[PDB]
Amino acid sequence: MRCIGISNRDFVEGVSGGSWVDIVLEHGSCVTTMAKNKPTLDFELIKTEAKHPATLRKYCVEAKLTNTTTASRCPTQGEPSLNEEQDKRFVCKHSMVDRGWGNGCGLFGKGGIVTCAMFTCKKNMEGKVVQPENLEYTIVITPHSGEENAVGNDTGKHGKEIKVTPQSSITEAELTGYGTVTMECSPRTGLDFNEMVLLQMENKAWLVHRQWFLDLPLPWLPGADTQGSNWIQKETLVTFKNPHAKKQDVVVLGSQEGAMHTALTGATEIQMSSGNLLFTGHLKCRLRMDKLQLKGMSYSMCTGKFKVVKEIAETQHGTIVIRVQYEGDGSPCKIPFEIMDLEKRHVLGRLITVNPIVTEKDSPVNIEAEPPFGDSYIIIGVEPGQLKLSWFKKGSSIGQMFETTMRGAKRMAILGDTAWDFGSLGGVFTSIGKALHQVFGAIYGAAFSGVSWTMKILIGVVITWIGMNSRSTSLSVSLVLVGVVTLYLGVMVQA
C-alpha cells in the first residue's frame, strides 16, 4: 500500500548479492521492491526532523527612525562632527551643501555637513543552522498483501515509523511475522549540511545554502544579539535625500519582505513551526532482506467461489490493483491468482502481492499486478473456474523502455550520482559509472553552476553550434555531450 497513486515510483526488481539492495528515496517519491522471494515492501519517506539548531544571523526587513540630529561646520575649515555619531546604533553620513551670508556665517563656500539617526528594527529573520547531527529521518515501510481500506491512507499503523539518525545506524526494523528487516542509511551523504541554512521569516521558512545567505545584503547582525542593536550595514537600508542645495534628509527604506520573497524563489522552502518540519531532501539507504518470511507457507489453495468487489484500477502503467472478497469456508488459504494469455496457456503476467493470502475471512483483500502490453486474461478462479476478467493494457513495449529511459534521465538529473547508486550491485560497471560521473559531472555540471533557465539553454545551443563547426572529430566531445547535458538539463531543472 501507501505507494499507490503517488505516480513517480521506483520499481526495484530482484536483490541478489545474497542480501542487499540500494535504495535512494525522497519525500514526494516512494519505492516498491521485489525479489524472487520475500514479501514486496514499500519504502515511503516522511518528515525529516533536525532537533537542535543554532542561530546565525539577524536580518531585519523593516525599521524606523527618530531623534536624528545633524550638523555642519561651514564651508572650508573642519569636517563637521556630532556627539551621537559616537554610538553606532545611530546611522551617520557626511554630505556637502554650501553656506554663506544667507546661511549667515563665513566665507561663502560649499560646506561639509553630517547627520545621524537612531535605528530600530521590528521584524527579523531568525536564520539558524544545524550541524550534521541532531537530525533524523522517519520512514514508513509498508507491506502489501491485503488488509483492507487503502493502498493509500499513509495514516494508520502498518510499516511503523522506523526512525533513524546518523548517531545510530543499521536501522533494525520489525513487522508482524516476516517483518525482520535491516536498513542502513548514509545521512552524512545527504543534503550536505554546514552548507545549509534554515531561515524562519514571520512564519514561513526557507532552506538555502550558506554562502549566498552570508553575502545577502540588508542590515547585518550577529547571532549573539543580546540588546546589541548593533546592526552593521544600513547603508543599503535607509537612503538619504539631498535635494538641490540646502540641507539633507534621512528616509526609512521601507519593508523589502516581498522582494525578499522574489529573492528566495529558486529555493525550496520549508515550513518550520515546532523545532523543525523539514521536508524534501533525499536519502540513501541500503537494504539487507535476509531475515524475511514469505508471510505464510504450506497452506491449501483457497477452496473456490470468490466474489469480487470493484474493478480494475490501472494506475501509471501496470500495477492494476483489484479488490476481492472471498466467500466460503477454507480459512486463510492461498488465493490462486493468475494472469494468462488467450486460452492455450502461455501464461504470463507478473504478480505483485507476492503470495496473496486470505485473512480472517470476511475482509476486502486486494492485489496488484502487471499485465503485458496487450490483451490480458486474468483468472482468480479454480474448481468451477469461478472467475475470469477480460483486460486490455494499451501502450506497448518500446514506449515503456522509452519512458523508463526518461525516468532514469530525470534521476540522473535531480539526484546525482547517488542515482547511479540507486540500482543494486552492478559489480564493476555500476561502480565505475558512479565514479566516472562522480568526478566528471562534479567538474562539469558545477563550474558553470549558479546559472538559470535562460543562460543555460542559450549557452547550450551556442556551444553545440561551435561544436558543429569544429574539426578533428572532437565535435562529439563537444556536440553530443554538449547538447545533451545542456538542453536536457535545461528544461528539466528549475522546478
Epitope: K51, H52, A224, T226, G275
Partner: antibody
C-alpha cells in the same frame, strides 16, 4: 569557600535603570560562568542572562532584549547586572551564579553542562522594587 | 520554546511517606534536567543533576528518574525538614528555563 555576596536591596522610579552587583569568592573568578535569574514574588524562577568573567562575552534572554547590560571587574572578581527602563513588573528579587565549564566565551550546551547552576552556590538574592 | 511542565503544583503529605514529582518536556531534553529544593526566604538549593544523580552532602532519600521528555523526582521517606518548594530545570539549548515549582505541606 564557594560564596556570593550581592549588594543590598534597592528601590527605583519607573523608567529608570538599576545596577546590582555580584561578588564571588572561593575559586578562580575566571573559571565559572555567571548567570542572572530573577524571581517575582508571585512567580517562580526566570532566566535573565549570562556573562563570562573571562574575556567579557555575554548573552541575554529575549524577554529582556534591549533592556539589560552585563559587565565585570576582574580585579575585584565581581560582576555587574544592570536593567534599564525599569517598570513595576521588574520588581522582584535577583540572583547570580556560576558554571564549571570550558571557556573562552559564554554559551555552552555540549560541553560538561549543568552542575548546580544556582541551587548550592547561589547568592543570597537581592530585592529591587520599581515604584513611584 | 523548551516548555517545561511540572506536576503536581502542590502536595500535602504525612511524615515518612514517599513522594514523587514529574516534569514533562515539550522537546526531548535527553539527560539534562535538574531538581531543586528551596526553602522560603532561602536561596534555591541543589538536589538532582542529570536527572539521575544525588549531590554529595545530600541525604540518600532523594532520587530522580526519567529520560526523554519525562521525569520523576522521589523522596523515599518524607521528613519534616524537607518542607520546601521543589523545581526541575531544563538546561538544553540554553534558553534556560525552570519548572514552575511544587510546594509541600506536612501532615
Amino acid at each position: 569557600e564557594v560564596q556570593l555576596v550581592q549588594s543590598g536591596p534597592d528601590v527605583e522610579k519607573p523608567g529608570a535603570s538599576v545596577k546590582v552587583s555580584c561578588k564571588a569568592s572561593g575559586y578562580t573568578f575566571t573559571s565559572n560562568y555567571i548567570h542572572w535569574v530573577r524571581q517575582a514574588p508571585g512567580q517562580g524562577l526566570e532566566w535573565m542572562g549570562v556573562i563570562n568573567p573571562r574575556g567579557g562575552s555575554t548573552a541575554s534572554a529575549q524577554k529582556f532584549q534591549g533592556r539589560i547590560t552585563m559587565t565585570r571587574d576582574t580585579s575585584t572578581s565581581t560582576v555587574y547586572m544592570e536593567l534599564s527602563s525599569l517598570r513595576s513588573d521588574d520588581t522582584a528579587v535577583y540572583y547570580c551564579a556560576r558554571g564549571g565549564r570550558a571557556l573562552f566565551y559564554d554559551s555552552y550546551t555540549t560541553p560538561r553542562d549543568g552542575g548546580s547552576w544556582w541551587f548550592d552556590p547561589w547568592g543570597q538574592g537581592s530585592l529591587v522594587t520599581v515604584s513611584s | 520554546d523548551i516548555q517545561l511542565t511540572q506536576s503536581p503544583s502542590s502536595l500535602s503529605a504525612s511524615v515518612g511517606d514517599r513522594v514523587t514529582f514529574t516534569c514533562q518536556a515539550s522537546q526531548d531534553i535527553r539527560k539534562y534536567l535538574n531538581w531543586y529544593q528551596q526553602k522560603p526566604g532561602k536561596a534555591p538549593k541543589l538536589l538532582i543533576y542529570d536527572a539521575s544523580n544525588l549531590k554529595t552532602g545530600v541525604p540518600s532519600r532523594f532520587s530522580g528518574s526519567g529520560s526523554g521528555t519525562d521525569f520523576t523526582f522521589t523522596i523515599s521517606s518524607l521528613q519534616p525538614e524537607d518542607v520546601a518548594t521543589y523545581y526541575c530545570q531544563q538546561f538544553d539549548d540554553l534558553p534556560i528555563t525552570f519548572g514552575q515549582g511544587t510546594r509541600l505541606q506536612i501532615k
